[PDB]
């Protein structure tokens, strides 16, 4: 006998939560974006999204080979039933995980908070977003904690369109004297799917087509065809 559907559908969740946590912790340097676990009773493949996907593989497919055996011997299911797929992300500028680790690179790379946040802001807004916000909080200067918001564009804070038009990312950076935590949000654009942004419009955006000038009549024309 097997497990109940209630306990089955939740256990498919704690799998993808621990997998994503371990993947963030390991691949937080090569720009890890997210998993996609396509389940199949033959082979439960796990599709890794990344920024520089050729560097994830290692030397002609070497580094991900370690991770295959890790996820094989970890989660109890036998070998030959999982296929890793390091895929290039669609746009790195429209991924909150990919930007909030890029800001960690510049902050730990010893750069000013102004130029780093405004450069990531410029890159996000040139990447095509309707708006974004970057908040860097902590002991930025001195030993009283500040925050620093960098608003640009539009942002939604309320109602159900905040569930699919924004994407949030919280990253802790570790400096010498404490923890800064950064929070990045990006308000995604339109394009009914071009694999970027939602298909649904904003639910108060009414769009009215322009009328075409019909040829005005003067005489009753009875035109046979």
């Amino acid at each position: 006998v097997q497990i109940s559907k209630k306990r089955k559908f939740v256990a498919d969740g704690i799998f993808k939560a621990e997998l994503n946590e371990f993947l963030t912790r390991e691949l937080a340097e090569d720009g890890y974006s997210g998993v996609e676990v396509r389940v199949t009773p033959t082979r439960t493949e796990i599709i890794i999204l990344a920024t520089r996907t050729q560097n994830v593989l290692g030397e002609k497919g070497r580094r991900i080979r370690e991770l295959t055996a890790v996820v094989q011997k970890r989660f109890g299911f036998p070998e030959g039933s999982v296929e890793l797929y390091a895929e290039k992300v669609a746009t790195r500028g429209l991924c909150a995980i990919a930007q909030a680790e890029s800001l960690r690179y510049k902050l730990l790379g010893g750069l000013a908070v102004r130029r780093a946040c405004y450069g990531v802001l410029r890159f996000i807004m040139e990447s095509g977003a309707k708006g974004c916000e970057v908040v860097v909080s902590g002991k930025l200067r001195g030993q009283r904690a500040k925050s620093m918001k960098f608003v640009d564009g539009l942002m939604i804070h309320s109602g159900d369109p905040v569930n699919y038009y924004v994407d949030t990312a919280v990253r802790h950076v570790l400096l010498r004297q404490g923890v800064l935590g950064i929070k990045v949000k990006i308000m995604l654009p339109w394009d009914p799917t071009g694999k970027i942004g939602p298909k649904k419009p904003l639910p108060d955006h009414v769009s009215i087509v322009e009328p075409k000038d019909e040829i005005l009549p003067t005489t009753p024309i009875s035109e046979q065809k």
């Binding site: 000013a112 908070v113 102004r114 130029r115 200067r141």
Partner: peptide, 29 residues
């Protein structure tokens, strides 16, 4: 960063120094 230094310290003791460093950054030299 002279911009960030100026915007943080313009009220403090080091206001004239960050003003001079901002003007050095702005007007060449």
């Amino acid at each position: 960063d002279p911009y960030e230094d100026f915007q943080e310290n313009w009220n403090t003791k080091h206001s004239s120094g960050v003003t001079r460093e901002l003007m050095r950054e702005l007007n060449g030299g």
